[PDB]
Amino acid sequence: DEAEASKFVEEYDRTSQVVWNEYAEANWNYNTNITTETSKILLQKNMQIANHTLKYGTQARKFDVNQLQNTTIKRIIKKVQDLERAALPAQELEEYNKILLDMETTYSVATVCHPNGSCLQLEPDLTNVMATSRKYEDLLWAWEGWRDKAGRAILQFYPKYVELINQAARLNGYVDAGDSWRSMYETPSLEQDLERLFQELQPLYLNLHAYVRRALHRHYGAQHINLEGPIPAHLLGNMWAQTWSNIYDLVVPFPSAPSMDTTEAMLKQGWTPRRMFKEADDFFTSLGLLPVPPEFWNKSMLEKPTDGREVVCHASAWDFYNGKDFRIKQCTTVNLEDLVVAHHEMGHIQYFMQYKDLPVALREGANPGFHEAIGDVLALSVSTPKHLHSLNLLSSGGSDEHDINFLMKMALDKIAFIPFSYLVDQWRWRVFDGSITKENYNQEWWSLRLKYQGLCPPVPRTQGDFDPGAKFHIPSSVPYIRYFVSFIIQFQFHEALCQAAGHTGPLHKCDIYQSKEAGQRLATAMKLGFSRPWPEAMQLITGQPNMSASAMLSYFKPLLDWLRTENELHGEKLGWPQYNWTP
Ligand SMILES: O=C(N[C@@H](Cc1ccccc1)P(=O)(O)[C@@H]1CCC[C@H]1C(=O)N[C@@H](Cc1c[nH]c2ccccc12)C(=O)O)OCc1ccccc1
Ligand SMILES: [Cl-]
Ligand SMILES: [Cl-]
Ligand SMILES: [Zn+2]
């Protein structure tokens, strides 16, 4: 029993390193150059990894996990018993593989053109229209156009995807795919936990929603904005209305206090994509944390290719499973937004390197949310006026008005995201559990878009529309609740790391730069990887075991007070009692 289990673990680990390393590069070649050849080679490398997973997964299932003495060994074998997609019969496996590939390619090659012959890709073209245009009709063209081309074209694949991913999940002992996804957190109370955490941030979100709805009322006209209704989903400076910081100019609390154009400030002093990752590297090393290998700089795709290549532009960070080769792939634009994104990517990279000496089965974040949180934590300190001024991207800081402005900028990004990141997998769990059918995909999406976010589609939805398909993580099959957890827990990390750094006074003024006390708590948690249940890693960073929104609420507390006063003086109905309103 016990000695065979130890040998199995070792054999699995060394062989997976080879098989997963070979898969990583084939997958990289498809991502950095979408062709029919790299698509073929990947689908073939899917079959080799499936063979490995099946061989070792079948053998792991003959071990009684219950009889196993060693805790680490027992936790590995149990994980290896989950074949995931490899549990599918050969014919379904290759269909599910082609489906996943066809959804990725469809999303990534989608363009939106005018009759004049000019066509727009999502990054950077449609993305810039969403962020900078203040014309109702232009935003609507980019918003509808993206959903017409990407969303609609994903719909032919999705019901077959749901069937196959669910089947593989049943074959691994789960009730459905969303059940398999939720189990990554190892928390039976998970749904309740997240629901409570969502309700905690309701008052702060409803007040932000009401404040911004008024500002859109000012700008876009009383005829197009309902002050008791949902906000049209194309007016928030982002394609999915998931973050609202790009319309900051429309909502500035104190316009008498102008802040530098951080983007033109980056362009003015000749910031590059390379510079942005070099600065993220520096923030990571300032904490006493690992620098990126030299190899990283030679192998990563830090900017969008210009040699006429078709790519997956939605960013990702890569582990090639040898402990040396880690890469980022980003279609980077020189702005504050992608500087924050670069840090997110470098936190994934830092995580790979921190747990690189664990068995591969344990080479994961404490939970998926821990992995998304790490780069966002540093980025919170980066985005402070103090630190931005030190990068020469600002000129100051000080007055309670600059404070409210900075906090508003932060809330338009962080608070606005809470209902959205909660939504996606609420929709998807109900698609997976069978309660939402292909008949109700879209209607149920907008039902939740209304309920949680207070948004309405600017144009009524017709038959054949599949608006979830216009969002990366859906055709790409990436779980989303990881980002909801991340946004809550990053402020907990921030609060506790600020305490270690000896920050007194308001949390939003904290800048953990160069703190070896902050660095030590992240490194100690990250080195665990997936070895222990996550409340341990949570305890190690924050001195306690639970997820809480209190650290986030504390950070925005001065904004909540300002929003309440400001909304109360404008007589705003919080929420959307007239929910059925459509523009
Ligand atoms: O890079 C990814 N994952 C990403 C996307 C991906 C997943 C799977 C296959 C292919 C690609 P991303 O989250 O970095 C990633 C790439 C750019 C931002 C991130 C994102 O998606 N964010 C969400 C949420 C979001 C909105 N605004 C922001 C701002 C900052 C962070 C997140 C965020 C989004 O909808 O785009 O995976 C790293 C990893 C490997 C192994 C174990 C654990 C983690
Ligand atoms: Cl949508
Ligand atoms: Cl997840
Ligand atoms: Zn991420």
378 lines ligand 1 (CB under 6 A): no
Nearest CA to ligand 1 atom 3: 316
Experimental method: X-ray
DSSP state of 192: H
Q: What Å distances lie between residue 73 and 4, 52, 143, CA to CA? A: 10, 19, 50
- Give the residue before each break in the chain, using a C-to-N cut-off of over 2.5 angstroms; say none if it is continuous: 396
Q: Which atom of ligand 1 is nearest to the CA of 472?
A: 35
579 Cα–ligand 2 center, Å: 16
469 Cα–ligand 4 center, Å: 19
Is the CB of residue 267 less than 8 Å from the CB of residue 295?
no
Q: What Å distances lie between residue 220 and 241, 456, 458, 461, 577, CA to CA? A: 16, 15, 13, 22, 21
Token output for 487: 């946004």
342 lines ligand 1 (CB under 6 A): no
371 lines ligand 1 (CB under 6 A): yes
Domain parsing of the chain, residue ranges: 1-583
Residues in the chain: 583
Give, for 231, the enclosing helix (H) or strand (E). strand 231-232
DSSP string, 319-337: E-SSSS-EEEE----SSHH
* Annotation says 37 is catalytic: no
How many angstroms separate the CA atoms of 382 and 280, rounded? Answer: 9
* Annotation says 473 is catalytic: yes
Give helix then strand counts, H and E, for the chain. Answer: 25, 6
Token output for 36: 């029919």
101 Cα–ligand 2 center, Å: 22
**Annotated binding residue at 309?**
no
Burial of 44 (0-12, 13-18, 19+ CB in 10 A): exposed
Burial of 90 (0-12, 13-18, 19+ CB in 10 A): exposed
- Give CA angle at 249 (244, 251), nearest 5°: 70
- Of these residues, 104, 345, 364, 572, which one is catalytic? 345
